[PDB]
Amino acid sequence: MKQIEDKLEEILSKLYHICNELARIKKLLGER
Amino acid sequence: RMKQIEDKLEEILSKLYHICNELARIKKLLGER
Amino acid sequence: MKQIEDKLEEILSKLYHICNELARIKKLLGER
Amino acid sequence: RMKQIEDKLEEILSKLYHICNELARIKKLLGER
């Protein structure tokens, strides 16, 4: 169960990296 | 057409933020085990 | 706890929608 | 430049599939409660 809690933190960190990268992609497309 | 992609990325980012909040909420409930 | 299991199924379904849409976006960009 | 975006979307999709498998693995472990 703690292994699950630690996995969730890990997954959340990965998702924040993805959000940052999608925002970068949306910027780049916006720049033309 | 590129504006439609941009707008969809914006929508996908908001959905992903919602998912992150829900998974954070789960994590808190597991720390209350 | 079952509420958590049901939330995870819900989140997974949403993520599969997102994957499908990103693939559509990658197609569209590829088409020029 | 557009090929770099496409390649990054491909990388992000593979990361999201990995996340989906990990969350499915959690879900199974919660059904074994």
Side-chain angles (χ1 to χ4, degrees), chain A residues 1 4-26 28-31, chain B residues 1-2 5-24 26-27 29-32, chain C residues 1 4-26 28-31, chain D residues 1-2 5-24 26-27 29-32:
Chain A
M1 192 78 355
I4 294 169
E5 172 162 10
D6 287 348
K7 184 51 78 165
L8 293 164
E9 186 276 340
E10 180 194 340
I11 289 162
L12 285 160
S13 79
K14 286 178 183 181
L15 287 164
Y16 306 152
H17 295 293
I18 289 159
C19 285
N20 285 333
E21 195 67 9
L22 285 172
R24 167 180 181 250
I25 286 166
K26 184 179 65 74
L28 291 180
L29 290 177
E31 280 176 359
Chain B
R1 232 243 193 121
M2 183 63 66
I5 291 173
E6 298 168 52
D7 290 350
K8 188 53 71 173
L9 292 170
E10 178 191 275
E11 182 174 6
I12 287 170
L13 280 160
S14 170
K15 294 171 148 86
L16 288 168
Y17 306 150
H18 173 69
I19 287 160
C20 289
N21 287 330
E22 298 276 24
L23 283 174
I26 297 175
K27 189 181 165 208
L29 262 352
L30 291 178
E32 295 175 349
Chain C
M1 192 78 355
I4 294 169
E5 172 162 11
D6 287 348
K7 184 51 78 165
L8 293 164
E9 186 276 340
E10 180 194 340
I11 289 162
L12 285 160
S13 79
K14 286 178 183 181
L15 287 164
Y16 306 152
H17 295 293
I18 289 159
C19 285
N20 285 333
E21 195 67 9
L22 285 172
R24 167 180 181 250
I25 286 166
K26 184 179 65 74
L28 291 180
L29 290 177
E31 280 176 359
Chain D
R1 232 243 193 121
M2 183 63 66
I5 291 173
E6 298 168 52
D7 290 350
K8 188 53 71 173
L9 292 170
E10 178 191 275
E11 182 174 6
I12 287 170
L13 280 160
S14 170
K15 294 171 148 86
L16 288 168
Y17 306 150
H18 173 69
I19 287 160
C20 289
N21 287 330
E22 298 276 24
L23 283 174
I26 297 175
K27 189 181 165 208
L29 262 352
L30 291 178
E32 295 175 349

Coordinates of all heavy atoms in Angstrom, one line a residue, chain C, unseen atoms left out:
Chain C
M1 N -12.3 2.5 -0.4 CA -11.4 1.7 -1.3 C -11.9 1.2 -2.7 O -11.3 1.2 -3.7 CB -11.2 0.5 -0.6 CG -10.0 -0.4 -1.1 SD -8.2 0.3 -0.6 CE -8.4 2.0 0.3
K2 N -13.1 0.6 -2.6 CA -13.8 0.4 -3.9 C -14.0 1.7 -4.6 O -14.0 1.7 -5.9 CB -15.1 -0.5 -3.8 CG -15.8 -0.8 -5.2
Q3 N -14.2 2.9 -3.9 CA -14.5 4.2 -4.5 C -13.2 4.6 -5.3 O -13.2 5.0 -6.4 CB -14.9 5.4 -3.6 CG -16.3 5.8 -3.2
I4 N -12.0 4.2 -4.7 CA -10.7 4.4 -5.3 C -10.5 3.6 -6.6 O -10.1 4.1 -7.7 CB -9.5 4.2 -4.4 CG1 -9.6 5.3 -3.4 CG2 -8.2 4.2 -5.1 CD1 -8.6 5.0 -2.2
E5 N -10.9 2.3 -6.5 CA -10.8 1.4 -7.7 C -11.7 2.0 -8.8 O -11.3 2.0 -10.0 CB -11.3 0.0 -7.3 CG -11.5 -0.9 -8.4 CD -11.6 -2.4 -8.0 OE1 -11.7 -2.6 -6.8 OE2 -11.3 -3.2 -9.0
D6 N -12.9 2.5 -8.5 CA -13.8 3.0 -9.5 C -13.3 4.3 -10.1 O -13.4 4.5 -11.3 CB -15.1 3.2 -8.9 CG -16.0 2.0 -8.6 OD1 -15.6 0.8 -9.0 OD2 -16.9 2.2 -7.8
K7 N -12.6 5.1 -9.3 CA -12.0 6.4 -9.7 C -10.9 6.1 -10.7 O -10.7 6.7 -11.7 CB -11.6 7.2 -8.6 CG -11.0 8.6 -8.8 CD -11.9 9.4 -9.8 CE -13.1 10.0 -9.1 NZ -13.7 11.1 -9.9
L8 N -10.1 5.1 -10.4 CA -9.0 4.7 -11.3 C -9.6 4.2 -12.6 O -9.0 4.5 -13.7 CB -8.1 3.6 -10.7 CG -7.3 4.1 -9.5 CD1 -6.8 2.9 -8.7 CD2 -6.2 5.1 -9.9
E9 N -10.6 3.4 -12.7 CA -11.2 3.0 -14.0 C -11.6 4.3 -14.7 O -11.4 4.4 -16.0 CB -12.4 2.1 -13.7 CG -13.0 1.6 -15.1 CD -14.0 2.4 -15.8 OE1 -14.6 3.3 -15.1 OE2 -14.1 2.3 -17.0
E10 N -12.2 5.3 -14.0 CA -12.8 6.5 -14.6 C -11.5 7.3 -15.2 O -11.5 7.7 -16.4 CB -13.4 7.3 -13.6 CG -13.9 8.6 -14.1 CD -14.2 9.6 -13.0 OE1 -14.4 9.2 -11.8 OE2 -14.2 10.8 -13.4
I11 N -10.5 7.4 -14.4 CA -9.3 8.1 -14.9 C -8.7 7.4 -16.0 O -8.2 8.1 -17.1 CB -8.2 8.2 -13.7 CG1 -8.7 9.2 -12.7 CG2 -6.8 8.6 -14.2 CD1 -8.1 9.1 -11.3
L12 N -8.6 6.1 -16.1 CA -8.1 5.4 -17.2 C -8.9 5.6 -18.5 O -8.3 5.9 -19.5 CB -8.0 3.8 -17.0 CG -6.9 3.4 -16.1 CD1 -7.1 1.9 -15.5 CD2 -5.6 3.4 -16.8
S13 N -10.2 5.7 -18.3 CA -11.0 6.0 -19.5 C -10.8 7.3 -20.1 O -10.6 7.5 -21.3 CB -12.5 5.8 -19.1 OG -13.1 6.8 -18.3
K14 N -10.6 8.3 -19.2 CA -10.3 9.7 -19.6 C -8.9 9.7 -20.3 O -8.7 10.4 -21.3 CB -10.3 10.5 -18.4 CG -11.7 10.9 -17.8 CD -11.7 11.7 -16.5 CE -13.1 12.0 -15.9 NZ -13.3 12.9 -14.6
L15 N -7.9 9.0 -19.8 CA -6.6 9.0 -20.4 C -6.6 8.4 -21.7 O -6.0 8.8 -22.7 CB -5.6 8.3 -19.5 CG -5.2 9.0 -18.3 CD1 -4.5 8.2 -17.2 CD2 -4.3 10.3 -18.6
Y16 N -7.4 7.3 -21.9 CA -7.5 6.7 -23.3 C -8.2 7.6 -24.3 O -7.6 7.7 -25.4 CB -8.4 5.4 -23.2 CG -8.0 4.4 -22.3 CD1 -9.0 3.6 -21.8 CD2 -6.8 4.1 -22.0 CE1 -8.7 2.5 -21.0 CE2 -6.5 3.1 -21.1 CZ -7.5 2.3 -20.6 OH -7.2 1.3 -19.8
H17 N -9.1 8.4 -23.9 CA -9.7 9.5 -24.7 C -8.6 10.5 -25.1 O -8.4 10.8 -26.3 CB -10.9 10.3 -24.2 CG -12.1 9.4 -24.0 ND1 -12.8 8.9 -25.1 CD2 -12.7 8.9 -22.9 CE1 -13.6 7.9 -24.6 NE2 -13.7 8.0 -23.3
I18 N -7.8 10.9 -24.1 CA -6.7 11.8 -24.4 C -5.7 11.2 -25.3 O -5.2 11.9 -26.3 CB -6.0 12.3 -23.0 CG1 -7.0 13.2 -22.3 CG2 -4.7 12.9 -23.3 CD1 -6.7 13.4 -20.9
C19 N -5.3 10.0 -25.2 CA -4.3 9.3 -26.1 C -4.9 9.3 -27.5 O -4.2 9.6 -28.4 CB -4.1 7.9 -25.6 SG -3.0 7.8 -24.2
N20 N -6.2 9.0 -27.7 CA -6.8 9.0 -29.0 C -6.8 10.3 -29.6 O -6.5 10.5 -30.8 CB -8.2 8.4 -28.9 CG -8.2 6.9 -28.6 OD1 -7.3 6.2 -29.0 ND2 -9.3 6.4 -28.0
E21 N -7.0 11.4 -28.8 CA -7.0 12.7 -29.3 C -5.6 13.2 -29.7 O -5.4 13.9 -30.6 CB -7.7 13.7 -28.4 CG -8.0 15.0 -29.0 CD -9.1 14.9 -30.1 OE1 -9.8 13.9 -30.3 OE2 -9.2 15.8 -30.9
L22 N -4.6 12.9 -28.9 CA -3.2 13.2 -29.3 C -2.8 12.5 -30.5 O -1.9 13.1 -31.3 CB -2.3 12.9 -28.1 CG -2.4 13.8 -26.9 CD1 -1.7 13.3 -25.7 CD2 -1.9 15.3 -27.2
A23 N -3.2 11.3 -30.7 CA -2.9 10.6 -32.0 C -3.6 11.3 -33.0 O -2.9 11.3 -34.2 CB -3.3 9.1 -31.9
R24 N -4.8 11.7 -32.9 CA -5.5 12.5 -34.0 C -4.7 13.8 -34.3 O -4.4 14.1 -35.5 CB -6.8 12.9 -33.6 CG -7.5 14.0 -34.5 CD -8.9 14.3 -34.1 NE -9.5 15.3 -34.9 CZ -9.7 16.5 -34.5 NH1 -9.4 17.0 -33.3 NH2 -10.3 17.4 -35.5
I25 N -4.2 14.5 -33.3 CA -3.4 15.7 -33.5 C -2.2 15.3 -34.2 O -1.8 16.0 -35.2 CB -3.2 16.4 -32.1 CG1 -4.4 17.1 -31.6 CG2 -2.0 17.4 -32.3 CD1 -4.3 17.5 -30.2
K26 N -1.4 14.3 -33.8 CA -0.2 13.9 -34.5 C -0.5 13.6 -36.0 O 0.4 14.0 -36.9 CB 0.5 12.7 -33.8 CG 1.8 12.3 -34.3 CD 2.4 11.1 -33.4 CE 1.7 9.9 -33.4 NZ 1.9 9.2 -34.7
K27 N -1.6 12.9 -36.3 CA -2.0 12.7 -37.7 C -2.2 14.0 -38.5 O -1.7 14.1 -39.6 CB -3.2 11.8 -37.7 CG -3.7 11.4 -39.2 CD -4.8 10.6 -39.1
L28 N -3.0 14.8 -38.0 CA -3.4 16.1 -38.6 C -2.1 16.9 -38.8 O -1.9 17.5 -39.9 CB -4.3 16.9 -37.7 CG -5.8 16.4 -37.5 CD1 -6.5 17.3 -36.7 CD2 -6.5 16.3 -38.9
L29 N -1.1 16.9 -37.9 CA 0.1 17.7 -38.1 C 0.9 17.1 -39.2 O 1.5 17.8 -40.0 CB 0.9 17.8 -36.8 CG 0.3 18.7 -35.8 CD1 1.2 18.6 -34.5 CD2 0.0 20.2 -36.2
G30 N 0.9 15.8 -39.2 CA 1.6 15.0 -40.2 C 1.1 15.2 -41.6 O 1.9 14.8 -42.6
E31 N -0.1 15.7 -41.8 CA -0.9 15.8 -43.1 C -0.6 17.1 -43.6 O -1.2 17.4 -44.7 CB -2.4 15.7 -42.8 CG -2.9 14.2 -42.6 CD -4.3 14.0 -42.3 OE1 -5.2 14.9 -42.1 OE2 -4.6 12.7 -42.2
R32 N 0.0 17.9 -42.8 CA 0.7 19.0 -43.1 C 0.4 20.4 -42.6 O -0.2 20.6 -41.4 CB 1.1 19.1 -44.7 CG 2.2 18.3 -44.9 CD 3.4 18.5 -43.8 NE 3.7 17.3 -43.1

